[PDB]
Symmetry: C3
Subunit: 184 residues, 3 copies
């Protein structure tokens, strides 16, 4: 169907450091040649759950990677658990594994895989801000990069970073919308 | 027939449809376009009259925001108690609306699993918020924050709240804004 | 078709200062009443390829204009080349010029053409930020304005501007998504 998502409940589905330490809520809606993407993050456990830059002054970011094979199937090496990622069915997911989602993959001409000696253009990046706890003075950068991972046919990489000293701040975010050019 | 039941909108005209401070003091231009599981939302605000038409933070140093609330019942019907007026909030027909008031728009409502109503002692997650910026008079040095919150209002089944705020001293600045696009997860 | 675009390749298609000095990657996807727009810019040659505000302290922006006739056909006077602008076919364009794209045009009631004595509202503008070289400390403002150009029925204008002193910074950008209300 036209929506590939994580069920948007708060049940953990993602490993940043350890199994099920986070809930990535990602919704990809196919509008023909463009994927409309909506993303938020809740860290439920482990070193990123509560940021304390007094205790850890160098703790300033982390990465969640979605790696896809040539059929647009999520690879086990992804931070997002494979069992949680599927076409929408009501407020859940299809009960059976999808076989193909190439129509949701980032376009390889728009966003080529990195090669040695190739001119690397920034158009495979989208920057956004999201806010911890919905507080306007707790921005974090969410940088989304398309097809820059090795060992896959396609990738969506979320780099989360911050440039303020956050003390005892739960890492759970507002939402950000972006789009990207679809492979087909 | 030209009924577009994949668009719930305030027509794109500049006819006032909203009360911030007084009846019909503003045009909230809000277009909700259903792209299946996601609503693509486009918003701007024109304050046409009343206290918030012209911001003067010399005269009113504490005036740094205001709120527009859309409250919906269980059928996604806008409640009369909302800031937004009901009469031209409807499914699209060309540059106007469907000839009768809609009875159901649950497909345009913010998803209650994604954006649960608050209950006493409930863990509040921020993912029911989207932040954006719009600019007064289209001037790059006149930013205002538009914070959109889903389903956080009491006495309704769904809600979309727009909190406008600014963090600069605006002196004799007309409150009429650039547009901002966001999306949210649809209830169905 | 539901996508009007520049192919997603890096082949120059746009004149900022001189013919083919830039690749504007612009994808307009019709989602009913709204056009979902995705934009990035690569300057490949001429005065805007490498910004040096030490040498050129007044170089703080430039404009790319798409002018359309009453049928939503791109006019030759546009910065974007006409041969590069068409309905999608896979990763390329239809080989034959489109005759009608009014469904992709910015709504004239939402975004009226300027007239003397008529109140000009800012809602025909969307602001965004993109980043030169994908570097978070190299923001540029991309201001998009609907239907404000003379000598056309519809227009999309991209005003690029910056306030920072950029020294030897290549003008090639991250991507930005916005939407606008469609004429029909």
């Amino acid at each position: 169907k036209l929506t590939l998502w994580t069920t948007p409940d708060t049940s953990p589905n993602c490993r940043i450091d350890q199994d099920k330490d986070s809930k990535l809520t990602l919704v990809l809606t196919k509008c023909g040649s463009q994927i409309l993407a909506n993303v938020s993050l809740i860290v439920v456990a482990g070193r990123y759950k509560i940021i304390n830059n007094n205790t850890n002054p160098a703790l300033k970011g982390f990465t969640i990677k979605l790696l896809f094979d040539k059929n647009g199937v999520l690879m086990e090496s992804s931070n997002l658990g494979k069992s949680y990622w599927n076409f929408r069915n009501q407020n859940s997911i299809m009960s059976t594994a999808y076989e193909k989602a190439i129509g949701f993959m980032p376009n390889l001409v728009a966003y080529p895989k990195p090669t040695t000696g190739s001119k690397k253009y920034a158009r495979d990046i989208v920057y956004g801000n999201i806010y911890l706890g919905g507080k306007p003075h707790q921005p974090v950068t969410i940088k989304t990069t398309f097809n820059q991972e090795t060992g896959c046919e396609y990738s969506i990489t979320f780099d989360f970073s911050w440039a303020k000293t956050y003390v005892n701040v739960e890492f759970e975010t507002t939402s950000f919308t972006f789009s990207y050019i679809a492979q087909e």
